[PDB]
Design a protein around this ligand. Structure first.
Ligand SMILES: [Zn+2]
Lengths: 90, 4
């Protein structure tokens, strides 16, 4: 768990997975990929947010990798760096 | 994916 937290209620993988209960199954990215990469569903469209950095992303397409998208849009996220390392984030 |  990172020092910095934007949504303490979503600190656990289990809480983040729980938000995907009503995730549209037509979206081509799996809930476990998103939750593992720090993301939870905010309940509208395919909108998600990271529990650590509060970074928000939508319009998930086939082939999107949540870790790669996390590092390109929110490269200074503390959770991202603790999980994947400085070396993974361009 | 894009930012909101
Ligand atoms: Zn983040």
């Amino acid at each position: 768990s990172p020092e910095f937290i934007s949504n303490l209620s979503m600190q656990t993988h289990a809480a983040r997975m729980r938000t995907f209960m009503y995730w549209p199954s037509s979206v081509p990215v799996q809930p476990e990929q998103l939750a593992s990469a720090g993301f939870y569903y905010v309940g509208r469209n395919d909108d998600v947010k990271c529990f650590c950095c509060d970074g928000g992303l939508r319009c998930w397409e086939s082939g999107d990798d949540p870790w790669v998208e996390h590092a390109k849009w929110f490269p200074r996220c503390e959770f991202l760096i603790r999980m994947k390392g400085q070396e993974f984030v361009d | 994916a894009r930012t909101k």
